[PDB]
Chain A
Amino acid sequence: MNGVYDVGGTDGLGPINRPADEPVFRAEWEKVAFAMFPATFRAGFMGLDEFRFGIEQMNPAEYLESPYYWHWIRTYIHHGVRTGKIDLEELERRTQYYRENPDAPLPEHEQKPELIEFVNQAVYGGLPASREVDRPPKFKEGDVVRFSTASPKGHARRARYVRGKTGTVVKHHGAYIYPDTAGNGLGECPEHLYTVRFTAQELWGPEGDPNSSVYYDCWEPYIELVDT
């Protein structure tokens, strides 16, 4: 989608706010928001691509100025409601309850060893998106390609700043989960992945740095051949 979240190239966002140092978690709620990622993933709320799409659909003004982990909370609620796993009305009732009673206890619950096992496995083993496909790669290193000008309303990894631009294939990484299908609940539908080099001049016109290039990853359908 042509969301405001796609900030690459956007002007007027202001200076970088960078403290000399900071903690990993600035508040207890952040630790909870963070841990909810593997929890909701295991529960089938969404996959990684869908996770991103939920954030992309946020109110832009809220996205631009809210604490980072709040974005995660928004996507959990988004998918919880989508899948019917979260009743919004009950969530709103409970929110007011904790506003009035912030120190009220959490529900009694049993600890589950399977959830710790999942955490350790996911953290140290990872969640690889690499997949094997039957089709051979259409492109190769050195090929000059042009990025699609398509503008899907659903999830995609097509930054507005690279659309319609011409670049050179730097490397073929093999096939991976395709965002355009995965983030929209249409499955993995793996596609070959390539890193493509775009000169700053090609991307920004004369306002671009005469000696700079941007490397951007493109799934096969994103690019078409110009010169072999």
Chain B
Amino acid sequence: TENILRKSDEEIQKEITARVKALESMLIEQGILTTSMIDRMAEIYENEVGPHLGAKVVVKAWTDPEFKKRLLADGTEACKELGIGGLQGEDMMWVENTDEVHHVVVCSLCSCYPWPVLGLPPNWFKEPQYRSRVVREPRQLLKEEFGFEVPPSKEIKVWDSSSEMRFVVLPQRPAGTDGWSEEELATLVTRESMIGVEPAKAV
């Protein structure tokens, strides 16, 4: 939104860059931060941990009723069966979308998100606009912002992650996918379908 008091994006970026490099130089001198530590953290979340991991969990649940039961009973333990878990996903609770219920997740207080299965959150999830409105007008938000119309008769359950429990949505399996392989089904699972702002890809 327009703010006549705000500097340009260029000036803001220039100021932040200088402040960060300054802080970085100090933490480096103190011996608590190194260039390799920075590169390793970046490498993990740019190439190793991402929504493709959550997609693996989703497709296993879609094709294995027993695993699905274990997943809904204890998300952390179930995901561990696939070697998935860790930082900011120590406690996971998966919620299943059905014909009568639709789930959507948010961290109204900051930006909490299940990193082990979805990687780092997109910027909109962390911003005030989505966070403020989803707990108050979820139906209108889903339709207006994501083009996803949820029938007024269908209940919308908004999960606000106020604790370390991380909520993840298990989207419904799209129709016309009978007998598909786990690999084929994975192409339909999006990061958005696991947040609840969109259903899994149709067709």
- Is B119 in contact with A16, judged by CB distance below 8 angstroms? no
| C-alpha gap A99/B13 in the complex (Å) | 11
Is B188's CB within 8 Å of the partner chain A? no
Instruction: Give the distance to chain A from B146, nearest Cβ to Cβ, in Å.
Output: 9
Q: B41-52 vs A: 1/0 string, CB under 8 Å?
A: 110111001000
| C-alpha gap A159/B155 in the complex (Å) | 23
Q: Chain A residues with Cβ under 8 A from B77's Cβ?
A: none
- Is A128 in contact with B91, judged by CB distance below 8 angstroms? yes
- Is B155 in contact with A217, judged by CB distance below 8 angstroms? no
| C-alpha gap A95/B137 in the complex (Å) | 43
Q: Chain B residues with Cβ under 8 A from A189's Cβ?
A: none
Interface extent on B, as a size class?
Answer: 35 or more
Instruction: Give the distance to chain A from B105, nearest Cβ to Cβ, in Å.
Output: 9
List CB contacts (< 8 Å) of A176-190 with chain B: 176-177
Interface residues of A, dominant DSSP: mixed
- Is B109 in contact with A159, judged by CB distance below 8 angstroms? yes
Residue in contact with A5 in the complex, picked from B12, B110, B139, CB distance below 8 Å: B110
Q: Chain A residues with Cβ under 8 A from B128's Cβ?
A: 7, 10, 13, 64
Q: Chain A residues with Cβ under 8 A from B18's Cβ?
A: 95-96, 98-99, 102
Q: Give 4 closest A-B pairs by Cβ, nearest first.
A: A8-B108, A217-B163, A94-B22, A35-B38
By a beta-carbon cutoff of 8 Å, the part of chain A in contact with chain B is 5-11, 13-19, 22, 24-25, 27-29, 31-40, 42-43, 48, 52, 55, 61, 64-68, 70, 73, 76-77, 85-86, 90-91, 94-99, 102, 106-107, 109-112, 115-116, 119-120, 122-130, 157, 159, 161, 171, 173, 176-177, 193, 195, 203-204, 208-219
